Amino acid sequence: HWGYGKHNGPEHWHKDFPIAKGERQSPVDIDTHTAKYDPSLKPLSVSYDQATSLRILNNGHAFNVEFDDSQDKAVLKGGPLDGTYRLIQFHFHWGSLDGQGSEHTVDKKKYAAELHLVHWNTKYGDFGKAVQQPDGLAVLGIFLKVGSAKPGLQKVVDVLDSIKTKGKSADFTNFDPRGLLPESLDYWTYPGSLTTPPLLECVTWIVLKEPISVSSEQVLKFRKLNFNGEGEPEELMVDNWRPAQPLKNRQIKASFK
Numbered sequence: 001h002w003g004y005g006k007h008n009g010p011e012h013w014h015k016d017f018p019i020a021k022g023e024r025q026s027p028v029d030i031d032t033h034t035a036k037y038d039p040s041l042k043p044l045s046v047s048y049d050q051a052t053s054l055r056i057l058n059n060g061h062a063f064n065v066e067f068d069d070s071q072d073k074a075v076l077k078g079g080p081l082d083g084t085y086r087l088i089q090f091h092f093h094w095g096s097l098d099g100q101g102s103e104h105t106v107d108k109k110k111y112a113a114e115l116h117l118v119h120w121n122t123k124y125g126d127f128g129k130a131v132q133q134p135d136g137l138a139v140l141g142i143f144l145k146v147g148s149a150k151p152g153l154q155k156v157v158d159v160l161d162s163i164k165t166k167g168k169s170a171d172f173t174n175f176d177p178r179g180l181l182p183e184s185l186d187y188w189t190y191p192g193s194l195t196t197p198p199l200l201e202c203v204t205w206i207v208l209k210e211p212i213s214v215s216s217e218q219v220l221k222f223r224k225l226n227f228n229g230e231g232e233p234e235e236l237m238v239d240n241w242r243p244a245q246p247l248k249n250r251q252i253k254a255s256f257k
């Protein structure tokens with residue numbers, strides 16, 4: 001099966017998923033000098049007041065915080081988007097050390113981790129139909145640097161001991177993802193893909209410029225998770241990031257001067 005190792009990591013994925021070498025793959029390096037300010041881009045509208053988290057899951061690649069997406073509650077709109085995108089889950093990518101972990105890079109700078117809030121376009125009715133469309137998903141990406149603790153992250157950190165291994169889940173209700181957002185919603189945007197198999201080219205990426213700070217202790221708890229299932233040899237869940245892919249025929253647009 002695909003994963004993040006020497007034998008099954010990103011440089012192997014193209015064998016089972018040939019779109020890995022496609023024209024709109026993610027992540028990418030954001031060259032800040034080349035990204036053009038687009039005065040036509042709108043402010044991002046992040047409406048998470050009514051978000052209903054259900055559960056947290058270790059899927060063997062990351063942990064997913066899942067939301068009830070059966071109504072228009074938690075939605076992303078505006079920015080570069082046409083229409084309404086519903087929050088379905090968030091997860092992170094992180095490193096074995098603070099100098100790597102992010103998927104997007106900024107002038108080749110790697111952050112310690114990257115948060116992905118995944119949303120689907122309600123015009124396609126369900127997530128499985130949305131991923132078959134070039135405008136099916138919007139993923140809001142947020143960089144993590146190590147410094148001060150993020151108080152709004154601690155409820156996630158504290159539940160990880162209960163989902164150490166692949167296939168473990170835990171009730172995770174009433175988690176407010178507003179506590180994971182930075183102050184500024186300034187962003188870069190470009191058309192891309194899922195960054196894990198099946199690598200579908202269905203994503204409008206919205207990457208916030210301002211990182212959030214998390215503590216060394218918070219990210220060290222991410223690194224205690226396991227890729228393996230219960231009663232299997234321990235492989236620490238670290239370095240679950242895909243490197244930057246070729247930009248090809250794409251423009252990265254900035255919301256800000």
Ligand SMILES: [N]S(=O)(=O)[C][C][C]C1234B567B89%10B5%11%12B85%13B98%14B%1061B821B326B%115(B%12724)C%13%1416
Binds near residue numbers: 116118194196198
């Ligand atoms: N890094 S990313 O592009 O947000 C994709 C995250 C991984 C996935 B795979 B497939 B299943 B499904 B799609 B993809 B996104 B979560 B579940 B799992 C959803």
Ligand SMILES: [Zn+2]
Binds near residue numbers: 091092093116195
């Ligand atoms: Zn992701």
